[PDB]
Amino acid sequence: EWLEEAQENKIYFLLQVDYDGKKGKAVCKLFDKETQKIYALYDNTGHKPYFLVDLEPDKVGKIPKIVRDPSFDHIETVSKIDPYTWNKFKLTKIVVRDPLAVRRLRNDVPKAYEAHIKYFNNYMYDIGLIPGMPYVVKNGKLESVYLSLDEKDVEEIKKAFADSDEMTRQMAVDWLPIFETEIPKIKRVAIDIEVYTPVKGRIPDSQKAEFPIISIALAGSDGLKKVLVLNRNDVNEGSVKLDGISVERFNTEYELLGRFFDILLEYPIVLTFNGDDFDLPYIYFRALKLGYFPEEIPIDVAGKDEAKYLAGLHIDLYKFFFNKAVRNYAFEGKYNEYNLDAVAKALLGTSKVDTLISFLDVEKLIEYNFRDAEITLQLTTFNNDLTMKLIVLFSRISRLGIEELTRTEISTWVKNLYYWEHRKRNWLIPLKEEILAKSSNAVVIDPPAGIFFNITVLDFASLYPSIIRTWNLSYETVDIQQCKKPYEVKDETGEVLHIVCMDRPGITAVITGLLRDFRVKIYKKKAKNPNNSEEQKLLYDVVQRAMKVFINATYGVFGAETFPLYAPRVAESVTALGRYVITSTVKKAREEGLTVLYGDTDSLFLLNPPKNSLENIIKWVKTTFNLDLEVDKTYKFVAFSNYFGVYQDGKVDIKGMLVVKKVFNEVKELMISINSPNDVKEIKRKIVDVVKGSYEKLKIDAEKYLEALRSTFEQILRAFGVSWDEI
């Protein structure tokens, strides 16, 4: 087909596994840096799709809907460890011939386990594969390659985990390679099409593909800059350059797409921005109405919300940046909108258009079309290929393949890590129902309003993740029946909301703790350490960024009730101990001479205290619980009413309350940047616009319009003065 088979005893980077319905096998998609191509290794083990049932082989054999099904293969018996007790028991295993038979047969039995795992992930779990990592093909199977590490590097890992439990220490050595292994440079082309629209504001159905493609832009990471354009009211195919952009011209759309395929086929990865929904399907269905056979088109659009590029991987980057964990934790909330221009400005700082693109002359169509594709490539290129590296590390940590990962929420990424590790341990992955039944048997402190001076803030570095590990919280250690070493988890009235077993390490506690400690104890440090070469400085930086994404996302996914491993008592125990830690840390500040103005879930705003008293409560947290409290910030001053920070170098951290609006904004911020310890005359400069903006504006909207001017100023005047009227 489009993919050539991988060769015996060559080395490739695994990128993902797919299922081939035709051959009925899992296929590993293997990247070769030498040829810059992707090859296929088809499973040569006996591996088939399956699910588990806790009935007996002879009873399952009397269910004729299973046994007489054409995809029915055979029944076996396997063993699993119960996460709750670590006891070994037996389950029966229904093996069928194809993934679809798993979906069909799993409800012919009362209670099917491991029956909602996509076949290519289930293969990954059982073989023990890690995408984004290098392997050698030995006897048609993948074997991991030798990793060259400094002895000092590995001693440094082992020292940081010497105090941890058996599970953590071996898991730490088992994960090391995925943080020390180089990331491959993968050749890639972002593409972007434009189609003809008679009416201006009307996005054409990409299935119907009613109108011609007028151009396609291709921006490649190997320097390619291309625009293929359809000659509309003229007829010659001459080629030219336009500020570095190779423009080719075509009289028929058939030959335009012909040549788009030829170029596409040079790349192992195609990048789009919303190409799953638009670009690739539009190309695919135009190509069919133009006289391409299905089998000549290296795109498949048979999947529901997906476009596959048959000679490699297609990453739709719309879906990557729209990922909420990527948006918030990878890129610090820098974009609020998910369209190309919004993401590009936030991450690249690169800023429109007169008419619709159907009206545009050839020259402006070419610049505009190419710019879209160029920006799409650059989202993958900025900061020494940061986002290619993030994607690869995210695959490694989640063990999800690249295409599934860039199209899924982080809760799918975390689920996949946890299923993988269960399966490596031979643990049964529990049903969501069973976690509920096996579980069976008031705010943050407010800020006084006004003006307060020289404030230092105190943050818990990563609070919820840190308490997950510190208190051994996991779905299998909270509110369980048989428990030798219980631990009470109270909140306020010493109520004892839940019990937590310390008999065994909880898997969630082990993994979040291990990720966290890999980050703070080793990789944060290593990344900004001058003795490291610049190549490995960048690797370690991405490593710690990516760790951060999973750490900070962990509570949110485990706290959502849709999550397959959601235990209400885990989530509730986390917030409980969160209150307990911040409440308790508040009392110690009140008994050290510290004045506590503001306090949310993991932060404490402190009124200029001595350096002696800060060091007391920090080291006190380390002895009471085992958390790291630290000196976050040092505001020049802050104002309250929801707050309004000010730094001594300029910039302000205005929490909320920022939705005339342009000229007036700049005056307010340079007036507040003047701020010294004075007060009453500082506010009279700003009171010029209270009565001015409110009362003078005479010379859908009528007279209530002036309350919308007041909402970009409502909370700031509450700090200084009080409320007023002008009727």
Ligand SMILES: [Mg+2]
């Ligand atoms: Mg475009």
